[model samples]
Target: GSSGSSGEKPYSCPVCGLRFKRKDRMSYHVRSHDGSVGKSGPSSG
Candidate 1:
């Protein structure tokens, strides 16, 4: 049944409950919660 349902999304995020078409794509989205990107702060001052 799994192979027959390739178009369906089974994996979801616990924090946001966002569904993805593939497992790998869901894992990639989780990395955004790590605070790896620049936040609102002083530019050079």
Candidate 2:
């Protein structure tokens, strides 16, 4: 399935000049700009 391969483009980051396959990936990298890559709390099992 293809519509316009000639005009195909990749996701870009505003903060950094980088290209990614997906937009989400670009956002993930942008978060690094803020520092600290955490998901949830630490310890508690």
Candidate 3:
């Protein structure tokens, strides 16, 4: 979440509700909405 100005991510994706503090992250997340790059896999944690 290396967003500018603030210290945390403030943008929330309307498609899947994914949060991204950086614009790059948000763009990456947008792909998920169109089924471009979906979640890698289930929780490994």
Taking all chains together, each candidate's TM-score versus the true structure is 0.39, 0.37, 0.40
Provide the lDDT at 9 for model 2. Answer: 49
What lDDT tens digits, residue by residue, belong to model 2 across residues 1-34? 2335565545655456555678777778967776
TM-score ranking of the models: 3, 1, 2
Candidate 1 wrongly placed segments (more than 4 Å) = 1-9, 34-45
> Which candidate leads the pack in lDDT?
3
lDDT value, residue 42 of candidate 2: 86
Identify the runs in model 3 with alpha carbons over 4 angstroms from their true place. Answer: 1-10, 35-45
Q: Provide backbone clash counts, one per model.
A: 0, 0, 1
Model 2 scores a C-alpha lDDT of 0.65
**Alpha-carbon lDDT, every model:** 0.64, 0.65, 0.66
TM-score result, candidate 2: 0.37
- In model 2, which runs have C-alpha deviations exceeding 4 angstroms? 1-10, 34-45
List all candidate RMSDs to the true structure.
7.7, 7.3, 10.5
- Can you write out model 1's per-residue Cα lDDT over 1-45, one digit (the tens) per residue? 123554555675655556667778887886666547667887896
Per-residue alpha-carbon lDDT of candidate 3 for residues 1-45, written as tens digits (9 for 90 to 100): 433665555566867656667787787777767764356778687
Ten-residue segment with the worst summed lDDT in candidate 2? 1-10
